[PDB]
Structure 1
Amino acid sequence: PYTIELIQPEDGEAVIAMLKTFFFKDEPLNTFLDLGECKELEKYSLKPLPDNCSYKAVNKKGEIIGVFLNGLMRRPSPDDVPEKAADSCEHPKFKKILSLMDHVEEQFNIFDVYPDEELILDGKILSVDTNYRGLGIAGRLTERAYEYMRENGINVYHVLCSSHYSARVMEKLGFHEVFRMQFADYKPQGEVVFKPAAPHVGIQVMAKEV
Structure 2
Amino acid sequence: NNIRFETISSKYYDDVIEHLRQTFFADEPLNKAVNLTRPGQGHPLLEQHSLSTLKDNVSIMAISNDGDIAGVALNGILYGNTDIEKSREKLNEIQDESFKKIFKLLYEQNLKINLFKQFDVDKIFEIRILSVDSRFRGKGLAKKLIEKSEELALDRGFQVMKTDATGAFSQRVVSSLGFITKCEINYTDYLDENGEQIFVVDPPHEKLKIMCKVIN
Give the structure-1-normalised TM-score: 0.90
Residue 194 of structure 1, CA deviation: 0.6
Distance (Å, rounded) in 1 between the aligned partners of 2:133 and 2:116 = 32
2:14 aligns with 13
TM-superposition CA deviations, 1:108-137 (whole Å, max 9, x none) = 3332432x1111101111111012123211
Distance (Å, rounded) in 2 between the aligned partners of 1:22 and 1:128 = 8
Paired residue type of 1:102 = Y
Q: Percent identity?
A: 32
Matched, 1:183 2:187: yes
Give secondary structure in 2 for the equivalent of 1:180: strand
TM-superposition CA deviations, 1:33-67 (whole Å, max 9, x none) = 22224110000111111211001111111011111
Paired residue type of 2:154 = R
**Contact 2:113/2:182, CA 8 A, preserved across alignment:** no
Task: State which drifts further: 200-209 or 87-96.
Answer: 87-96
**Contact 2:112/2:183, CA 8 A, preserved across alignment:** no
Give secondary structure in 2 for the equivalent of 1:199: coil
1:34 aligns with 35
Matched, 1:113 2:118: yes
Matched, 1:127 2:127: no
Paired residue type of 1:54 = S
Residue 163 of structure 1, CA deviation: 2.1
TM-superposition CA deviations, 1:172-207 (whole Å, max 9, x none) = 122111110111222353532011135311101111
Match of 2:109 among 78, 101, 104: 104
**Contact 2:130/2:170, CA 8 A, preserved across alignment:** no
**Contact 1:38/1:94, CA 8 A, preserved across alignment:** no
Match of 1:157 among 157, 161, 167: 161
Give the structure-2-normalised TM-score: 0.88
Distance (Å, rounded) in 1 between the aligned partners of 2:174 and 2:200 = 23
Q: CA RMSD in A?
A: 1.9
Distance (Å, rounded) in 2 between the aligned partners of 1:110 and 1:90 = 30
**Contact 1:40/1:89, CA 8 A, preserved across alignment:** no
Distance (Å, rounded) in 2 between the aligned partners of 1:186 and 1:109 = 22
Residue 7 of structure 1, CA deviation: 0.6
**Contact 1:164/1:204, CA 8 A, preserved across alignment:** no
TM-superposition CA deviations, 1:70-103 (whole Å, max 9, x none) = 11111136x7435324323222222221121112
**Contact 2:182/2:212, CA 8 A, preserved across alignment:** yes
Distance (Å, rounded) in 2 between the aligned partners of 1:134 and 1:31 = 23
Distance (Å, rounded) in 1 between the aligned partners of 2:84 and 2:198 = 29
Distance (Å, rounded) in 2 between the aligned partners of 1:80 and 1:197 = 33
Listed as ranges, the matches of 1:193-204 within 5 Å are: 193-197=198-202, 199-204=204-209
Paired residue type of 1:53 = V
Task: State which drifts further: 123-132 or 80-89.
Answer: 80-89
Unaligned runs of 5+ in 2: none
Distance (Å, rounded) in 2 between the aligned partners of 1:74 and 1:98 = 18
Match of 1:60 among 39, 60, 65: 65
